[PDB]
Design a binder for this molecule. Structure first.
Ligand SMILES: Cc1cc2nc3c(=O)[nH]c(=O)nc-3n(C[C@H](O)[C@H](O)[C@H](O)COP(=O)(O)O)c2cc1C
Ligand SMILES: CCOC(=O)c1[nH]cc(Cc2ccc(C(F)(F)F)c3ncoc23)c1C
Ligand SMILES: O=C(O)c1cc(=O)[nH]c(=O)[nH]1
Length: 376
């Protein structure tokens, strides 16, 4: 009930959301969100997640199939509050070895009528050292909090603006924060770091994945060890860009199979949406509803190109339970949200979980795992 108690669907946060989306700068609303979470003002979802909507990627056991995508909590300043809204996992970052301010503001803009966002942030983050300290503090609180014992935390890693070879920055981050991550997400798909997406070329991508895997394996040798949720070394995911041709996607699939990567995040923002009058002026990558179809088709292609052997984390225009089921039936095992929290507020997780559960029931699925890839 929106009015009777304090909970994710509390009516006042919807009043706030309407005021924010109409009058307040996008990045300012997001900072206010994080401040409320940093001081544990936001409401909790203490509901038991349905046993039939759980999912997994190898040993990662997601209590439910909805997490928060990278770029929402870049520095891990309110990991607890975001998770407690009802999410099973969060991807902090993307982080860089040293801190950097990013591109000039304003750099985030929303189109409410199309439920779309465009951003040109440029990997703004406090730096690997400080974000590592932020994550360690969460891991210590997690061991005591019975609401977070099974929640998953991944770390997205990139490179600083003036780094020549990306692997040098990735290796630094892994040795600093890898011990506290349940998985590592390699960001070679940001459209706001010039030249980053070139690293999706098969040759460079293979070298990057293998270098990241070796550094994670070296953490074990060089060094209680795994202060994370799984108590195992982090898995390795790659986050891919949607603006690729079929031959690019096929050679990427061959690399992902050859390197035994643990999963792929499909996908990052697109630069190929010029349908939004309000974004005419603007630079950066686009998120939200206008990315949904692009991202779902991309999931179908990679699911087939990898012969269903690489688990998929879905990202792009997921707002409703039907949207999530589309991603799942396309080949995704788990979903990430971002734009949904921007346009629907604190109730995003509670609402979408209920919609998905009622849909799996309406469609005749016994559980979510049964729906993975059923479109094929
Ligand atoms: C303001 C903003 C910042 C983002 N920062 C990152 C980031 O740092 N690393 C990353 O991998 N993705 C980043 N993303 C992309 C999102 O993680 C997500 O892949 C994308 O928004 C598509 O999901 P959506 O349609 O639900 O918003 C960012 C997106 C936005 C809008
Ligand atoms: C481009 C991304 O930045 C954003 O626009 C953004 N990020 C998160 C949100 C959602 C949100 C933010 C602040 C509050 C408030 F009022 F409680 F502080 C909210 N209440 C309900 O939803 C709220 C938004 C709009
Ligand atoms: O930091 C950014 O500018 C950024 C990174 C990324 O991976 N995706 C995105 O849309 N923006």
């Amino acid at each position: 009930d929106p009015f009777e108690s304090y909970n994710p669907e509390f009516f006042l946060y919807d009043i706030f959301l309407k005021f924010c989306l109409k009058y307040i700068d996008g990045e300012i609303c997001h900072d206010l969100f994080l401040l409320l979470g940093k001081y544990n003002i936001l409401p909790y979802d203490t509901s038991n997640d349905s046993i039939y909507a759980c999912t997994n990627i190898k040993h990662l056991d997601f209590i439910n199939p909805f997490g928060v995508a990278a770029g929402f909590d870049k520095n891990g300043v309110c990991i607890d509050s975001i998770l407690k809204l009802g999410f099973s996992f969060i991807e902090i970052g993307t982080i860089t070895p040293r801190g950097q301010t990013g591109n000039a503001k304003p750099r985030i803009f929303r189109d409410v009528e199309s439920r779309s966002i465009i951003n040109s942030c440029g990997f703004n983050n406090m730096g690997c050292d400080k974000v590592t300290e932020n994550l360690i503090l969460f891991r210590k609180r997690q061991e005591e909090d019975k609401l977070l014992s099974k929640h998953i935390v991944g770390v997205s890693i990139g490179k600083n603006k003036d780094t020549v070879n990306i692997v040098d920055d990735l290796k630094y981050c892994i040795n600093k924060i890898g011990r506290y991550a349940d998985y590592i997400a390699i960001n070679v798909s940001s459209p706001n770091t010039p030249g980053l997406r070139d690293n999706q070329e098969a040759g460079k991508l293979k070298n990057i994945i293998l270098s990241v895997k070796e550094e994670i394996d070296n953490l074990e040798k060089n060094n209680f060890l795994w202060f994370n949720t799984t108590k195992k070394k982090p898995l390795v995911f790659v986050k891919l860009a949607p603006d690729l041709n079929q031959e690019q996607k096929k050679e990427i699939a061959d690399v992902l199979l050859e390197t035994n990567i643990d999963g792929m995040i499909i996908s990052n923002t697109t630069t190929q949406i010029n349908d939004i009058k309000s974004f005419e002026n603007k630079k950066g990558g686009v998120s939200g509803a206008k990315l949904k179809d692009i991202s779902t088709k991309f999931i179908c292609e990679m699911y087939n190109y990898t012969n269903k052997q690489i688990p998929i984390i879905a990202s792009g225009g997921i707002f409703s339970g039907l949207d999530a089921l589309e991603k799942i039936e396309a080949g995704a095992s788990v979903c990430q949200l971002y734009s949904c929290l921007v346009f629907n507020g604190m109730k995003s997780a509670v609402q979408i979980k209920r919609e998905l559960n009622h849909l799996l029931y309406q469609r005749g699925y016994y559980n979510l795992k049964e729906a993975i890839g059923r479109k094929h």
